[PDB]
């Protein structure tokens, strides 16, 4: 199970807290991000990790670090 809604919600919360929500299409942005290499994860596409609970946790953490400012 991909659970995209949970990741969209996470992203929407982040933009609400830390940016501007007006005009922002979170599912559209998430779609591209999931399908692009993520250097923090060694160049893998995040979508390819969403088939395990561990991979789900890893992707959610990376998304959260966008806001937290921890280096990945």
């Amino acid at each position: 199970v991909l659970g995209l809604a949970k990741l969209v919600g996470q992203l929407e919360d982040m933009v609400e807290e830390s940016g501007e929500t007006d005009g922002f299409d979170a599912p559209e942005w998430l779609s591209s991000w999931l399908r692009q290499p993520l250097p923090a994860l060694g160049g893998v596409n995040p979508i390819d990790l969403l088939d395990t609970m561990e991979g789900q946790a890893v992707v959610s953490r990376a998304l959260a670090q966008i806001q937290s400012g921890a280096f990945a």
Partner: protein, 160 residues
């Protein structure tokens, strides 16, 4: 100057700000050099490096975030006391992607031992250049200051 500047590209959040020195953000998420629950401040030795670590490495361009360039002014006498980790003296595996137990453990031992208030570490992006870790729990971290100096607008996914 009697200080040396390090850099963050950071956002305000609901319970901490971009110029936070309490390490609140990294406490929540963890990072390459810290466990969830341990507060640490991550900064870069150049503004260019802060962009690579913050925007490029997490592929976070295109988000309508209110990002700030934050200057972290570190007293030179505190920097003189920093530990310096290098690719040569770090344990093998520090540069794993995704970050794994080697760098997280190294960072944890440094933080909990309180060996030094500051740890200079190589970037996994450019190992020859450095990031700074600040342990806000360390007595010597007193005197470090942080301020938003401008909006950070450079976003490689920006649409004109």
């Amino acid at each position: 100057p009697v200080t040396t500047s390090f850099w963050r590209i950071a956002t305000d959040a609901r319970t901490y700000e971009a110029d936070d020195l309490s390490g609140a953000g990294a406490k929540i998420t963890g990072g390459r050099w810290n466990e969830v629950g341990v507060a640490i401040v991550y900064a870069a030795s150049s503004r260019a490096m802060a962009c690579l670590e913050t925007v490029v490495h997490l592929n976070s361009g295109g988000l309508p975030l209110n990002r700030y360039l934050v200057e972290i002014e570190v007293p030179d006498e505190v920097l003189a006391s920093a530990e310096v980790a290098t690719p040569g003296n770090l344990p093998v595996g520090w540069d794993a992607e995704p970050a794994g137990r080697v760098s997280i453990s190294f960072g944890s031992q440094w933080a909990q031992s309180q060996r030094t208030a500051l740890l200079l570490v190589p970037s996994v992006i450019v190992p020859e250049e450095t990031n700074l870790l600040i342990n806000p729990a360390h007595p010597d971290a007193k005197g470090i200051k942080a301020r938003k100096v401008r909006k950070w607008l450079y976003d490689p996914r920006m649409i004109r």
